[PDB]
Write a protein that binds this ligand. Structure first.
Ligand SMILES: [Zn+2]
Ligand SMILES: [Zn+2]
Lengths: 50, 238, 87, 61
RNA sequence: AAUAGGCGGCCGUCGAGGGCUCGGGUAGAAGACCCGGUUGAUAGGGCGGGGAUGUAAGCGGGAAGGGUCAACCGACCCGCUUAGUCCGCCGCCCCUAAUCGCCCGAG
RNA sequence: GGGGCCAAGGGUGGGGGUGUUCACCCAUUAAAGGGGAACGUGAGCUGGGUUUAGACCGUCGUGAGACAGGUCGGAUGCUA
RNA sequence: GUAAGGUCCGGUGGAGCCGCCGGUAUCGCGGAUCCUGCCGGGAGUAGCAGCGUAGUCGGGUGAGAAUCCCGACCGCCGGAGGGGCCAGGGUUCCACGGCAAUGGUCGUCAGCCGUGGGUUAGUCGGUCCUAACCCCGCCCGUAACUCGGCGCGGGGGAAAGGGAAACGGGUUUAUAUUCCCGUACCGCGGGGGUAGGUGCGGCAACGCAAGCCCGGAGGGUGACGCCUCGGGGUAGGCGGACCGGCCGAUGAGGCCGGCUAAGCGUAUAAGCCCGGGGAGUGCCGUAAUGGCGAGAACCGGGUGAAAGCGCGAAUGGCCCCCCCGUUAGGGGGGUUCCGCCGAUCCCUGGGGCCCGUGAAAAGCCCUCCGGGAAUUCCGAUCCCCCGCGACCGUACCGAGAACCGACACAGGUGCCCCUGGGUGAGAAGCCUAAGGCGUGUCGGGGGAAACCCGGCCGAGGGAACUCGGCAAACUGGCCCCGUAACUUCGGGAGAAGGGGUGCCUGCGGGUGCGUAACCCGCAGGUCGCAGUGACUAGGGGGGCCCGACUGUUUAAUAAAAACACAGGUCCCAGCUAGCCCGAAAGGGUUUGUACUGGGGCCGACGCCUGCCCAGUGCCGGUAUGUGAAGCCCGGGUACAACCGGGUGAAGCACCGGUAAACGGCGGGGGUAACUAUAACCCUCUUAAGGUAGCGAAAUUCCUUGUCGGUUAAAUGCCGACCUGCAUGAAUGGCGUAACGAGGUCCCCGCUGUCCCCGGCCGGGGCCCGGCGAAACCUCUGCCUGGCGCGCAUGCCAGGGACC
RNA sequence: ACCCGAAACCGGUCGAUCUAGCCCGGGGCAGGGUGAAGUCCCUCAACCGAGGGAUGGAGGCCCGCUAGGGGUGCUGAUGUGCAGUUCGCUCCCGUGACCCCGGGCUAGGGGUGAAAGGCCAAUCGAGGCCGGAGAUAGCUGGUUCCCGCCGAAUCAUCCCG
RNA sequence: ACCGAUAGCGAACUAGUACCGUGAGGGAAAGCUGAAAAGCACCCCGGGAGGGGGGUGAAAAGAGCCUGAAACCGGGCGGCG
RNA sequence: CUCGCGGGUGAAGCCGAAGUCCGCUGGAACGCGGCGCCGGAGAGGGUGAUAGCCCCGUAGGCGUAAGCCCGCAGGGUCUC
RNA sequence: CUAAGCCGCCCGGUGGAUGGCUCGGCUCGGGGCGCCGACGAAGGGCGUGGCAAGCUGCGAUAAGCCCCGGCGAGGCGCAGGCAGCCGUCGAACCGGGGAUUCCCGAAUGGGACCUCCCGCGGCUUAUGCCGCACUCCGGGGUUUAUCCC
């Protein structure tokens, strides 16, 4: 929305920062056992809890 | 079964609560201490229309700086002066104890108890007649035709309530009735119990007739006092 | 336009800019004129305007220079005559 | 009516928002209390014995 | 047609006879079927015949009037004009394309 | 004309009221026969009647309500 | 080994495993429309049509192009598919690099994957005020509470209500009323002056800089419904002249640009006011209503909006021209006027309606009272200047792909605000400018069928079709004439029915200064089958039933005769009432008071509403009978338990009113000019026997009652009779104008409903290249007579059958 | 109590973004027709009267694909749909009892209802969620290895049987 | 004398996590290379994904990694056709 | 009660025997055959196979600040 | 040398059963230990790593800071990488004691349609500090308001 409160904006910012892929160096360090995390999200498909 | 309209009205929901914020305020007399043993002058400043009152109302400013709202008697003039107290002259718009009002006079806004503010004869176009005066009671005939005894110190105003004859003209339209009843938030339109389901009304049923006499006992419990309640008789008196 | 400007409490004007683009300007409506306390007739010598315009003016430019500037001339003269006679 | 076309009117103010106390999105905003922890209606937490939700949090069920 | 037929011709023990490809419909949902394929009028193009509408654009004249009763404007009409346009019909002319090529095939 | 025999190749239609089958009637006709096929045929159709949920009238029942008594309205799925 | 099963050989595997005795157990699989996982046939099939059918030709990038990019052509929307923006979404926004997956096909493209970025405020919103309403504290109730509640005190509550202040140009890949330049405004504090403390002009309305600080009161403003109309403006639009440019014959002629913000200064209109003035066989005025001795005409004036005008401002924006043109740049011109139409956008006044009365506070302005300083002094609402102005949102879509509906859903939310030219009454239909799109995203082929959906036409007849004129067809705009029964006098009514309508050449008329603009007639000439030529655009009439009308209803099979309605009548209540919610406390009607509050029934309007109080219900009385506990008396108990009597309220019994309270309103015996039926009239029978009306009815079983009209033919509709199985007066009776997507019958006109079906157009179907499921499935799957759980592809005997 | 399946009943809690009602604050309805009350004027006579012409804009008025709202027929298309109610044509209202947004209140034997047992988040002749709960049924379905030996019964009395 | 990854607590693991509903509340799936990464250097082809040689290892056990069944599908072989 | 003294218990923790002997199979000995050893220790686990003696542990012992408790010595209160 | 088709064996793909393993569960006699919070709890929001998304741990001193003891050469969590730094002045790790400890939350000076905002008194030169909620107990002053301490 055009008008937002700061607390909601900060929570949305935290979710935005969370939504990213696993580092490639993490993948090689873990030997391909860790390839993803449960916080991956698609804006038009998976909606935020808020 | 299910509840009745009268049963649901007792819970004070907004569907039934009166909208007491569109109105101008209650019209009560000034405290009895001012009026008793003293007579106060007041000036009529404005006459206006109260959404739910059935009568016009007027603003009065008294010589002691107190402002009040009163039921305007018929023929009241803006800018005129009125008197409230035992020594007030007998004229329309004057308020004074029933002991000082001669018999055969029309009065309105009578106090049930000295200082209660007035309960009787407040509707538009109504008046009561002073019948007899005694040292311990004054008899007054009310609009309903009853002779009621009031304490001599009870206060009343001389004249008749403005707005009479309101029922001469028809409410031609369902919309006219709609606005009239929406002004005060009265349940409108109303249904017929005989056309409800048996769950809703004592007279409800597939057939649109009452299966029982419509005169209900005065001792019937809530949810059953429908129709003619404790009726002495019914029908047309010849 | 924004929902706030969709209200009819704003008067809207279409203007063309010196750069050639048409713009919509919104302004707040002016108040009514002062009315006599007693009879309610309009007063004289009291300009209309919102609080900022009223504060933009000096004291003597917003009311007439005669006693009882809140009444029209008949009412002013009548009240003074009554007061003098009573005194 | 009552079906697909009805769900298009879910663009108004949400019924429930985040709760400052329990952190769950159950704060009834119009009435002013939480439907999960009772914030804004009581000082003590809203806990019921017929509910296993508060046991699920600490794996104590 | 399980008694799964008769006959003339052509081939085999390299090879008759076909299919795809090509130009078109006496045919057609795919398949199938029919005519033509330089031993040529199959389609297109040109010309000529027969048709359907109904007299083109342009120019010249008239036109109820108006216009300074002048220049000019004017719906519409008459002549060149059985015109102009068009043809999922026919005839003549190899001018263009029906070419190059590929694959089963009994023993 | 009346009665009976052989004969099932062919024909046996169009209209008025009524949902009607049926029966009645009209003008023609050689005649305008009766029947079986899950009372042939709704993964062919139509939905007028029957037979839900709404409502009116008559009668019955104290009442809720009911009537092989009337009346208005009332859905017909398919890529073989 | 009968078997449940055991053991051995060949191969894979790489670390555990078994014989026997004795115990223990979540100890043995074919089914539960069993549960979990995986895979099959259907199947390379449906779908990728229908509501907007859109692409083609050259060039480019690229391994790869119907699908991506540029140019032209051809198209769609154009009162929305264009522009602005809430809620919701939360990075979807921007650039570069990409195509394993997503995208109904492909894809070099992307709301997709990787990398790096992006949201700047004293003025715009929140923040301030309060509205409906809500919360905490005290207090009362509750066993108690996180529970219910009146009163008092405090607080909150609107991002579309009230409410201090900013607009132009430019800038970035992405932000701008926020950043840069130019020009302003408000709040607070400060400095130098000045008006004033101690000042003036007007008969007056009024004109003025017109002392400072603290507290209080009053007035105004904030601050207000709906309908209707006049006046004054402004956006936008149109025609002409001139300047520059593009097309055109480098003709006529068409199109494109000719721009201008806040702020500052400045005036009138309506309204109202101020002085003079002294009218009537009356004058004055409006669109209209109207005004006058309670002061008209008329002559002077004051105050008072939107606007325009000057600065801002040309140095800015826009169009064009010239030289340098290898990139990269630099200069010169202009941007000026008249006449119309004109808003739904602004300002301002009239008038009308309410049994309907259409918010509050904050803030702001003025006046008046009290108090406090000021004289070589104090001191502004007036000029000049200086300093300071915190916190949070600010990207983007804003929807036929960025929201909700599981979806890049034909729905819903938001069409929430706004809209050039022609035709035209019109924001209608059609065409078109601006802006947008070719992504309502799979393409190609074809006489390439049948058949299905959506359209166009059909000779002769014209409803013969059908339950039923279902569907389609006829009429259709405007001008003129003309118009029935009935009626509640309003209407019916656009009844019905008839005539005209194009283009061209000239006149007359209305308002107007006008040969500006809009509108109204007249004459003449002329073409077609057709002149509202396309688009737009009623078919009509006559009976009956029901409901007065507008309105509401089962979201998702019922829109109706059902509900509501206005009007009628009945019942309770004088207020510590009546009715109602609760466990209580308290509370709704109640900021109320009989012209009121609450409870039933009928349902506009016209004429009317008859008899019955025995039954049931309700209301009043109640001398008397009965009548629980308690109390009293006697008996019994060293006291009680216990037994018998007396008094005994309500309620019953008894008595009386009450039917616009529930309901009921029959039956026999009969009778008058036959042998004709029926009963004016008498007699019993229960409380009394159905009165006015209506009647085979939406009620009538016999029933397709009987008679008359409608047809050639009438289980229909209409009128009548009354033998009303089983009508009837407020669960109203009868009638009724107007009204109706209500039910039903008939007539004109019309037509492919039908005789009797035939052609044509677009999309599917069909073929080809791609993506690609699901319902369903015991295994199978030819028939005639049969046996059979009585209706067999599978059994019996026969007949057929190449895949 | 061998295992599975009920409609239902009770307790405490969650819901008025859908939809019903009411309160507070706000946006919208092209164009045209008809012509109520009110207010008048003109001409001839005048013992009475007769004949014409205006102005004004009311209505739960009228036509209307304006916007917006509704849903009669085709019993059209679709009916593993675009869609767990949609699309086209036709049709009805369109100044009012009108349509729609923001803020509030009414909650389950309860609310709300122009009364259809309608609506109360795809759920209504008593909502949803967890708990009693592994409810109960005489009713339906299922119940897992092998070989040996013997091998029935549907009938007398009683039971709301 | 408990079960041994459909078992055992719902969760052997980034599990009361992901995800579903406005809400009260509901709630999964998913363990294993090798002794040691020695996790395939270099060569040919392909736009790339990959393919074929050649190496490592006792064994490809090759990360889609212990063993590798059944159903299903492609090919070869024997019989019928 | 502790200005004082001694003692017990008390965190991490410390010590704790015996083969990595020869030959084969093997990628790798914890395996097979032979020869030895400790044992208050042959519970269990790891280590490239199944190990009492390779390692960790085990049988059996040791240490420990703060804190807690008992005793000595001294200073007080109260009861009978 | 049969087209389609059916059965059997072999090889290959698909799939993840079986066998083996197990830092996880479940159940137990006995034994140990059992509260935290206004000196601000539990629970939650947001931050914090060079490359850092989840979990875990920590809190603007943010996979950590300081001190006294054990251990004795490696260490930088789940988690096998690049590059770096830490440690012999004794780290990592273990037991004990301290420091920092954002916001909401009984939440408390006053408010919550957004875990974010707005105030009043004293000290402080200023950077900044200590108080200010309700219902009571034991006291004081006084403004007699329950006003202040
Ligand atoms: Zn006045
Ligand atoms: Zn909470």
């Amino acid at each position: 929305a055009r008008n937002k409160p700061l607390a909601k904006k900060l929570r949305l910012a935290k979710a935005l920062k969370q939504n990213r892929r696993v580092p490639v160096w993490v993948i090689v360090k873990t030997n391909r056992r860790v390839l993803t995390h449960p916080k991956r999200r698609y804006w038009r498909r998976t909606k935020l809890k808020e | 079964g299910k509840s009745l309209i009268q049963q649901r009205r007792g819970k004070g929901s907004p569907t039934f609560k009166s909208p007491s914020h569109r109105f101008r305020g209650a019209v009560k007399y000034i405290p009895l201490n001012y009026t008793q043993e003293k007579t106060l002058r007041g000036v009529v400043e404005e006459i206006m229309h109260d959404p739910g009152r059935t009568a016009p109302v007027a603003r009065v400013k008294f010589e002691n700086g107190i402002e009040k709202l009163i039921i305007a008697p018929e023929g009241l003039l803006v800018g005129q002066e009125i008197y409230i107290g035992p020594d007030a002259p007998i004229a329309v718009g004057n308020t004074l104890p029933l002991a000082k009002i001669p018999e055969g006079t029309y009065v309105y806004n009578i106090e049930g108890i000295p200082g209660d503010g007035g309960k009787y004869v407040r509707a538009g176009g109504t008046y009561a007649l002073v019948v007899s005066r005694e040292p311990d009671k004054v008899i007054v005939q009310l609009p309903s035709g009853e002779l009621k005894a009031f304490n001599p110190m009870c206060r009343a105003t001389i004249g008749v309530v403005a707005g009479g004859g309101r029922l001469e003209k028809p409410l031609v339209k369902a919309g006219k009735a709609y606005y009239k009843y929406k002004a005060r938030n009265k349940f409108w339109p109303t249904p017929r119990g005989v056309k409800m389901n048996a769950v809703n009304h004592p007279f409800g049923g597939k057939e649109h007739h009452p299966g029982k006499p419509t005169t209900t006992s005065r001792r019937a419990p809530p949810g059953r006092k429908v129709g003619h309640i404790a009726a002495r008789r019914t029908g047309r008196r010849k | 336009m924004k929902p706030m400007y969709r209200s009819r409490s704003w008067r809207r004007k279409y203007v063309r800019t010196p750069g050639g683009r048409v713009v919509i300007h919104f302004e707040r409506k002016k108040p009514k004129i002062a009315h006599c306390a007693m009879c309610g007739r309009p007063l004289n010598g009291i300009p209309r305007g919102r609080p900022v315009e009223m504060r933009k003016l000096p004291k003597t430019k917003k009311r007439p220079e005669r006693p009882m500037p809140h009444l029209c001339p008949r009412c002013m003269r009548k009240v003074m005559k009554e007061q003098i006679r009573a005194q | 009516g009552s079906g697909t076309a009805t769900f298009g009117k879910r663009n108004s103010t949400p019924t429930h928002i985040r709760c400052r106390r329990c952190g769950r999105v159950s704060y009834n905003v119009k009435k002013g209390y939480c439907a999960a922890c009772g914030f804004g209606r009581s000082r003590r937490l809203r806990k019921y014995r017929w509910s296993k939700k508060w046991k699920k949090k600490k794996n104590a069920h």
